[PDB]
Every structure is written in structure tokens, then in C-alpha cells.
Design a protein around this ligand. Structure first.
Ligand SMILES: [Mg+2]
Ligand SMILES: [Mg+2]
Ligand SMILES: [Mg+2]
Ligand SMILES: [Mg+2]
Ligand SMILES: [Mg+2]
Ligand SMILES: [Mg+2]
Ligand SMILES: [Mg+2]
Ligand SMILES: [Mg+2]
Ligand SMILES: [Mg+2]
Ligand SMILES: [Mg+2]
Ligand SMILES: [Mg+2]
Ligand SMILES: [Mg+2]
Ligand SMILES: [Mg+2]
Ligand SMILES: [Mg+2]
Ligand SMILES: [Mg+2]
Ligand SMILES: [Mg+2]
Ligand SMILES: [Mg+2]
Ligand SMILES: [Zn+2]
Ligand SMILES: [Zn+2]
Ligand SMILES: [Zn+2]
Lengths: 127, 214, 81, 25, 91, 97, 97
RNA sequence: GGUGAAAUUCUUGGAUUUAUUGAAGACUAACUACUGCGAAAGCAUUUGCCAAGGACGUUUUCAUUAAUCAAGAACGAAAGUUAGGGGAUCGAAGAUGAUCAGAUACCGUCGUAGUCUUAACCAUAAACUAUGCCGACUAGGGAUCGGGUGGUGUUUUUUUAAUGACCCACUCGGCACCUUACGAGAAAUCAAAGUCUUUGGGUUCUGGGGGGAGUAUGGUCGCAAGGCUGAAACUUAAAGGAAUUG
């Protein structure tokens, strides 16, 4: 009933990414991250930020011509934490409650048929 | 002080034949400028859309489909096919402990000389009265299944193009043909064609491509 | 238990045991005369063949080798002696 | 001291005596 | 009667040049003087003469090869690889 | 396998090994099937092949060198061709070959 | 002295299983000694699901959990997750809840 | 970007993110379990080939051919060493950012060797069940793995069978768990660690207070690193084990 673009939220710890793009993917439309709405490093991934940035993104999204979207939420992954970080949670709500539409959202976290030695050595990151 | 928004040319995406709709969405390019244009440069891209969204019914929530643009004629850009996928969440659900996984694949050709690698997955099932709490098969069981899945997969492909193969997968005939030969070996549940990743096509051929639209 | 007749074990509890752990040991296989009514005569088979026993005149088949007990083939009759 | 650090302590010790002794070969 | 504990053909050099170089030579020397199987006639009668030239005693075919051994690891993989690449082109 | 067939022949039939004597056999309409080593040079192969066709004798291209053809026939030397003369108890003659 | 019949954890008749990497500190740890957990949870969350459905297309949609199996390193598994530490007896008990 | 927080770092080179496409080398996620196999080290994608094996079945065959083993030998995680290839990743060394009284570290970055493979070495690990092997006997219970037998068992339909998976009973041989203890033990615990002052089935190996010390020396193996063999003088009243209360 709308005009569909793609959402794609990368939301690891230390920062959260939101940016809508063409349903094909190639041509982007609007972005902004957590590290763009507060200055403190320490607070780069926290919900309160991903909010204020999911706000910014929604604005441009409907200022160019996208009325809706599908999201692909995603973590760091690879040979790392494979778990959803703090701010995708918030940003999802902050972009639906924005007054945009939602339709079909799968996780696209890179999960290998495992390997390439994980970092941090055999004894693990110890402290 | 630019804003490339007041600068990009707009397009609308039309899918191929054998589904419900073909109108899927919109896209942004750039002005068909002299030297590097809105034509040849891009368009030839790809689009993932849950085929339920282009089949209507929700008995198709999983199953992702790749559409690729090969031709374009005045704002109207027509796609054909690039592959098929599964939703990550679906798969991660039909894989449970206490049971056997079974995967098997084959690289194979079609009439319209497309090469493709197609996948298939299946899991053991408990008998409808089975007391023991796991149910795995017997490795000899597994070898036997795969060889027969493979027997049936090569059969379907080299059916008329991906075109009828496209028509073939959609009502998941294959899934049950498997389960038929199968039943003589070992129970099993789920059983899907899961994935297929294309990977080699012949030569453009404006004819046959145009022969998907009207 | 504590006092029982080891000398006269009951036929059942005796029967359920292993072929070597009976009182005095002995086999638990058997022989049979077998006929596939294409012919008229009766060839004597072993319940645990191994060899796929080739019938008398007509090289038809008869039984197939298995885990233990032979699988007799199709339309055939027998008797244990 | 850790056993294995002591095992290394004397591994080295023998190398020096192994050395100094060669001097006189 | 075993004549030498380890220098082998390399005993001609006496004490000279230092073990480790003699080691390295002894290898290719053994490689390079040896008698090899002939692809064409089947008898083991290929001997070297000047690097990369391998010839058959009877039957007399000469092959180019490694400086000290008939077939070279690289040459061989390259044989395997061309094979594979050729396969595509009529299949 | 084929060697297993060859073996039956070599232990219960009659045969001859080597270029010259199978030629005698081929001229003589006596060969029932000649067998040929891989590395046997193409000129020889071609000639045997011609001698063969002229005598309506069939031909097996043994995938393997003379060295192995020899071990095939159970002999500690190497043979480039074998000539089946009589097929002992084996079905070589009237199977896939 | 000894403190568990399962010694560390779960390997009777094998000699070598294979290390996994701790999900938290990346410590290597044998797969049988490994402390695991299925992190089956929704994509949305607590009260976000109302807002979810409401500002969506379709009716009610579907809603598919995330699934990912967790591996902890003992020290990590003790430091936060499942562990506590139990009495000498409560240790013996393998039932979960 | 990274962390408890930072910083070294990366950024008109459009970084980070996105998209299509490719190359390299490693790995085998999820399924994976108180589940399998192997002499042990160890072994998880598919497919073909090559030979190997236990258990079971057996009115087959030989007929004492066997048990265990100084000497001697095959194999032997990881690292390490030689000569090629490879060199994505992670990463002894080194260099840095930080922290610290200091900080040669823990944490962050760069990253040599290495990590992979071929042809040779090396022969060691808490190489662990810290528990030799062969044989007998002694006590209950529910699971599971492989084999076999029994069943007018269930389910698959087609037209009933035949299959296959499932269910129940028993029986061999597996990996384990439960409960008891006749019994054993310094206890913790133990179906062997039981059948021992009521002390003998067969056989191999090692220990004899603690340090000195796996040191010195000789021999031997190794390219090396090091392996195997391996003392004494002198010193010393304890060192040690399991359990209890603090
Ligand atoms: Mg800590
Ligand atoms: Mg001097
Ligand atoms: Mg204590
Ligand atoms: Mg303790
Ligand atoms: Mg071990
Ligand atoms: Mg796998
Ligand atoms: Mg010895
Ligand atoms: Mg001696
Ligand atoms: Mg490297
Ligand atoms: Mg340093
Ligand atoms: Mg400093
Ligand atoms: Mg230092
Ligand atoms: Mg040792
Ligand atoms: Mg242990
Ligand atoms: Mg018992
Ligand atoms: Mg049965
Ligand atoms: Mg005193
Ligand atoms: Zn008959
Ligand atoms: Zn020659
Ligand atoms: Zn950890």
C-alpha cells in the first residue's frame, strides 16, 4: 500500500547503525548512527542515542519519498558476539513509532560454518 | 548545499511472470546524462523479496527470491531471476536437538543452458508412538537418502529452463516426491529445497527474456 | 535365591538363556525339508544358510543369507526335522 | 617458584655448564 | 659391507665445504644420477645428461624435465591444471 | 573384474604373449581376442588393429602399461599384447569384452 | 582430593573432544566441558510488540524469534550465567529448571 | 574503531555502512548427546576408490596354536628443528597506547616466527580413569549403542501382504548412569579400590622419610632443543594424605 525501501539495522555494542536504501540495495537514502547524536564515546551504542538517530533517519526517509520499509537487523557476528546489541531494539521502536510502516524483518547476522581462529588467544581475554 | 535528492531519476520495479504480482517497488538512479548515464551503468541490479509478498498467501513466509534486472524500456525495468533463499529464522527453528539433520546438493544444467546448484534439507521424525526419546537414523540411512534426493534433484532440473523449474519449486512438488521414495527408508519431517544459488547463465537473448511479459 | 535347584532348571528360564549358558549347551538352530511346488522333491536346508541354497534341479533360488536365520524365498513350505 | 619455571631454571643451568665445559674440551 | 655412515655419494668431498652444504648436494646428486621409469616404453632406463634433459637407454625418447629430477612438482601440478582447463573447453 | 577374468583364462585356457606370436595367431585366424597395453605405441596398436579387423578378431584396450598387463597374466616380465586362443572356463570372450 | 565423578564435565570413552571458544572471553574450552544455552528470544521485546504490529502492514504478520546457541567458559559461566555453586550434594543433581 | 573508561589507530583516500562481482588460505558452525569408533595419540561436509576392524550369527574349520612380557620395535597432541610450497586467520618475539609508586605484564594496536602442507627430524603432556593385562567368583535398577531371536504388537494402503520406521519380552558384546552394600578403605569414596592376619589363579612394571635432585658423572640417541639411563657427599624432624572444627 506504500512505497517500499530497505531498512537494515546493524546494532553491535559501541555503536548502532541505521540507514534506509533502495529495495535493491545499491542506491542509499539517509543514514546516521548512534555516534552521531551524542558526543561521549562511552555512550555510542545506548538506546537513548539510537532513538534520536532513528528519529533523524525517519525524517529524511519520508522527505525524499519512502513511505515504508522492511528491516534486516544484524549484529557484529563473524567470529564474534553473534548477539543483538543494545540499540537495534530501541531504534526499531523508534522507527516504527516514527509513523513509518513495517513489513517482514529477519536477522542477517553473519554466522559462519565456523572458523578462522577467533581473537583473544587460548586463555581468553582475562581480567 | 547540493542534496542529490533533487538530482536522481526515479524508477519502478516489475517482476517476471509466474507469481501473483510483478509490481514490487521503486528505485533511485541519477540523470541519464551524456557520459555515464541512468541506463547501462546500473539497473542491472538485484532485489530480494519474500515471495509471499509476490504470491499473497502466507504459507510462503519463508522462502526468499532474488530478482535481477537485465532489461529496461522507459521507466519500466524488467527482472528475471537470480536465485532463491530461506529466512534465517525459519531454518534455525526446524533444526532441533534429539534429531538428525540431512543435507545434500548437486550442480546441474537446464534446457536454456543455466547452471545452478540447488539445496535440500530434511530431518528425522519420531514414529507416531515412539517411546525412546531421540530418533536418529543409521548413517547407512543417511547415505541412502542423499543418493536418492540427488537422484530426484537432477531429474527436476534440466526440465524446461529455470522457467518451469521456477514453476516447479513454487508449489513444492519436489518436497513430497522426496518424501515418497524416502518413506520406504526412514520417517523424516520438514524436507525442503531450502536454497539454490544460480551461478552461471548463457547469453542475454532479448527474445526469451521478453517472453516472460505482457 | 539362597537355595534353588541348579540341577533341574525350569524349561522356560532355561529356554530364555544364551546357547552357551544353558545347563548343558547345545544349538538352537534347526534343519528343514523345503519344497517350491514347481518341483516335486524336497531339499533339506539349514535355518542359518550363509550360502544362498541353490535348489535341486531347477536353479530357481530358495533362501537368502541374513544376519542369522535365512530368509526363504516367495512361495515355499517346510518342516523342522 | 612454579615447578615448570624451576624446570626451566635448571634447563638453562645445564646449558651454561654445557658451555663452560666445552671451553676445556 | 656398509662403507660410510652418512655421507654416501657425498664422500668425494672429504671434509670440505661444511656438512650442511654437502647434505643439500647429496640430495640432488642422488636425484640427478638415478635411473627412472620411461613413460613411453615402460623399462626403467631414463638417465639425465645436462640439466632438464632426460633420455631413454633403449627406445631413445628424450624428455625435457627438472634440472635434477624427471618431473618437477610444479610441472606436475601444471599438467594437472591445464588438463582441468582443457576439460572445460570441449565439455 | 577384468583382471579377475583374465586370471581365469591364464589358469585354465591357452594363450600367447608378445607382438610377434599374436601376429602369427592373427594371420592364422586363431586369436579369439587380443588385449593391448596403454603405452604400446600407436603404430603397433594400429597394425594389430588392422591385422585384427582383417580376421574379424575383437580387441580390448587394457587401460594399463605393459608392466601391469604382465602382472595381469601373472608373469614377472612385461607384455605389450596378449592373444586369447582358447577361453578356459572364463566368460571374457562373451561378456562386456 | 577429586571433586567430581564427571571429572571436569562429560567425557567417558573418547580421549579428545574439540575446543569451542567462550562466547564471552573467547577462552578455549572443550565442547563437552562447555556450558551451553539456547538464546531463543523475540526480535522485538517486551512492550515494543504493540507498536510493532500497529505500525506494520499485513495483519498480525508472524513474529519470528532469534535463535543462537551460547557457549561459556566456566569462569564466565560462574561470573554471571548458570552456575551459582551448590552444596556438596546439590552438585550431584543434573536436572535443570 | 576499541574499552570499566580512554588512547595509540582510520578517516576528500568518502572512511565505518551499502551494493554486485572476484581472488586466497584455514575451518567444518547449528544437528552434537553422560551418543559412535580407534592400540593409544586421536577421529565430525559430499562423493569415488583402497585396503583394515570389532561385536553378533554360526550342528563351519584347525586343535592347545595360549596368558603376560627384560631386550628390541611400530605409532606417538602441542610446540620446536631441516628443505620446499603456503602464508586468509589468529598470533611466543619485538614495537607501541594506556594503566601503575613501578608495570619489562594483565587491557588496546602494529605484527616477525608460527599457525596449513610436502619430504625428513623430535618422542615429550595433568599423553589422566592420576587406577597394568589375562581368567574366575560376589548385587539390585531403569536408559541407551551394535547384533541376533521370538510376536494371529502398533503405524505406513493398495487389495491384503513384502518392506521400513516404531512397540513389548529375552539374549550376547559396548559407552555410561542410578540405588545399595554382603564387602573394602586412613578417609574421601569404591561392582572393584570386593572375594587379605580365615594373609597363595597367572603374569609384567614401579615405590621404600624429606630435601640435596631428575642435580653431578659415564654411556647413548638427536642438526639442535633436548630424550633414555642416572648417583653421591651434605643437610633435615618432619615433609605428606584424607577428613573435622574453626
Ligand atoms: Mg576475573
Ligand atoms: Mg678456546
Ligand atoms: Mg585437603
Ligand atoms: Mg581444591
Ligand atoms: Mg588426552
Ligand atoms: Mg556441517
Ligand atoms: Mg620396553
Ligand atoms: Mg643390550
Ligand atoms: Mg602468517
Ligand atoms: Mg612485549
Ligand atoms: Mg610504558
Ligand atoms: Mg619484554
Ligand atoms: Mg612422562
Ligand atoms: Mg583427567
Ligand atoms: Mg548389574
Ligand atoms: Mg524382529
Ligand atoms: Mg624442632
Ligand atoms: Zn525348486
Ligand atoms: Zn623408453
Ligand atoms: Zn569465558
Amino acid at each position: 500500500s506504500q512505497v517500499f525501501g530497505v531498512a537494515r539495522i546493524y546494532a553491535s555494542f559501541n555503536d548502532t547503525f541505521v540507514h534506509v536504501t533502495d529495495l535493491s540495495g545499491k542506491e542509499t537514502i539517509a543514514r546516521v548512527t548512534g555516534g552521531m547524536k551524542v558526543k561521549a564515546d562511552r555512550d555510542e551504542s545506548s538506546p537513548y542515542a539510537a532513538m534520536l538517530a532513528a528519529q533523524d533517519v525517519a525524517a529524511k526517509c519520508k522527505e525524499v519519498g519512502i513511505t515504508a520499509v522492511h528491516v534486516k537487523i544484524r549484529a557484529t557476528g563473524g567470529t564474534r558476539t553473534k548477539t543483538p546489541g543494545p540499540g537495534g531494539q530501541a531504534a526499531l521502536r523508534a522507527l516504527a513509532r516514527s509513523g513509518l510502516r513495517i513489513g517482514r524483518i529477519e536477522d542477517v547476522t553473519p554466522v559462519p560454518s565456523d572458523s578462522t581462529r577467533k581473537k583473544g588467544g587460548r586463555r581468553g581475554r582475562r581480567l | 548545499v547540493v542534496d542529490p535528492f533533487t538530482r536522481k531519476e526515479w524508477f519502478d520495479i516489475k517482476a517476471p511472470s509466474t507469481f501473483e504480482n510483478r509490481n514490487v517497488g521503486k528505485t533511485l538512479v541519477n540523470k541519464s546524462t551524456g557520459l555515464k548515464s541512468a541506463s547501462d551503468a546500473l539497473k542491472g541490479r538485484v532485489v530480494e523479496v519474500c515471495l509471499a509478498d509476490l504470491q499473497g498467501s502466507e504459507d510462503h513466509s519463508f522462502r526468499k527470491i532474488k530478482l535481477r534486472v537485465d532489461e529496461v524500456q522507459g521507466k519500466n525495468l524488467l527482472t528475471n531471476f537470480h536465485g532463491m533463499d530461506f529466512t534465517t529464522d525459519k531454518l534455525r527453528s526446524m533444526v532441533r536437538k534429539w534429531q538428525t539433520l540431512i543435507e545434500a546438493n548437486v550442480t546441474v544444467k537446464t534446457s536454456d543452458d543455466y547452471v545452478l546448484r540447488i539445496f535440500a534439507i530434511a530431518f528425522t521424525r519420531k514414529q507416531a508412538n515412539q517411546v525412546k526419546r531421540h530418533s536418529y537414523a543409521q548413517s547407512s540411512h543417511i547415505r541412502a537418502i542423499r543418493k536418492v534426493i540427488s537422484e530426484i534433484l537432477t531429474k527436476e532440473v534440466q526440465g524446461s529452463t529455470l522457467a518451469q523449474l521456477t514453476s516447479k519449486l513454487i508449489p513444492e512438488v519436489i518436497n513430497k516426491e522426496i518424501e515418497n521414495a524416502t518413506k520406504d527408508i526412514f520417517p523424516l519431517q520438514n524436507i525442503h529445497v531450502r536454497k539454490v544459488k544460480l551461478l552461471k547463465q548463457p547469453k542475454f537473448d532479448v527474445g526469451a527474456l521478453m517472453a516472460l511479459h505482457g | 535365591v539362597l537355595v534353588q535347584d541348579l540341577l533341574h532348571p525350569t524349561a522356560a528360564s532355561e529356554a530364555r538363556k544364551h546357547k552357551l549358558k544353558t545347563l548343558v549347551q547345545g544349538p538352537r538352530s534347526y534343519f528343514l525339508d523345503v519344497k517350491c511346488p514347481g518341483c516335486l522333491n524336497i531339499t533339506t536346508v539349514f535355518s542359518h544358510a550363509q550360502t544362498a541354497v541353490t535348489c535341486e534341479s531347477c536353479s530357481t533360488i530358495l533362501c537368502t543369507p541374513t544376519g542369522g536365520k535365512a530368509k526363504l524365498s516367495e512361495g515355499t513350505s517346510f518342516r523342522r526335522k | 617458584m612454579r615447578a615448570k619455571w624451576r624446570k626451566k631454571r635448571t634447563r638453562r643451568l645445564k646449558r651454561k655448564r654445557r658451555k663452560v665445559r666445552a671451553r676445556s674440551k | 659391507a656398509k662403507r660410510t655412515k652418512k655421507v654416501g655419494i657425498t664422500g668425494k668431498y672429504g671434509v670440505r665445504y661444511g656438512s650442511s652444504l654437502r647434505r643439500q648436494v647429496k640430495k640432488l646428486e642422488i636425484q640427478q644420477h638415478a635411473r627412472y621409469d620411461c613413460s613411453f616404453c615402460g623399462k626403467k632406463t631414463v638417465k639425465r645428461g645436462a640439466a632438464g634433459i632426460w633420455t631413454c637407454s633403449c627406445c631413445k625418447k628424450t624428455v625435457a624435465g627438472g634440472a635434477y629430477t624427471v618431473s618437477t612438482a610444479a610441472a606436475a601440478t601444471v599438467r594437472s591444471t591445464i588438463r582441468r582447463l582443457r576439460e572445460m573447453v570441449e565439455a | 573384474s577384468i583382471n579377475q577374468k583374465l586370471a581365469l583364462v591364464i589358469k585354465s585356457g591357452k594363450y600367447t604373449l608378445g607382438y610377434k606370436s599374436t601376429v602369427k595367431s592373427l594371420r592364422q585366424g586363431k586369436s579369439k581376442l587380443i588385449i593391448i597395453a596403454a603405452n604400446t605405441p600407436v603404430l603397433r596398436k594400429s597394425e594389430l588393429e588392422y591385422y585384427a579387423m582383417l580376421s574379424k578378431t575383437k580387441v580390448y584396450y587394457f587401460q594399463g602399461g605393459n608392466n601391469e598387463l604382465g602382472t595381469a597374466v601373472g608373469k614377472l616380465f612385461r607384455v605389450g599384447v596378449v592373444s586369447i586362443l582358447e577361453a578356459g572356463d572364463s566368460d571374457i570372450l562373451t561378456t562386456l569384452a | 582430593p577429586k571433586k567430581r565423578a564427571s571429572n571436569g564435565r562429560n567425557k567417558k570413552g573418547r580421549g579428545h573432544v574439540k575446543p569451542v571458544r567462550c562466547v564471552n572471553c573467547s577462552k578455549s574450552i572443550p565442547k563437552d566441558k562447555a556450558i551451553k544455552r539456547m538464546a531463543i528470544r523475540n526480535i522485538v521485546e517486551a512492550a515494543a510488540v504493540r507498536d510493532l504490529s500497529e505500525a506494520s502492514v499485513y495483519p498480525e504478520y508472524a513474529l519470528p524469534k532469534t535463535y543462537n546457541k551460547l557457549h561459556y567458559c566456566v569462569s564466565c559461566a560462574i561470573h554471571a550465567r548458570i552456575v551459582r555453586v551448590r552444596s556438596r550434594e546439590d552438585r550431584k543433581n543434573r536436572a535443570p529448571p
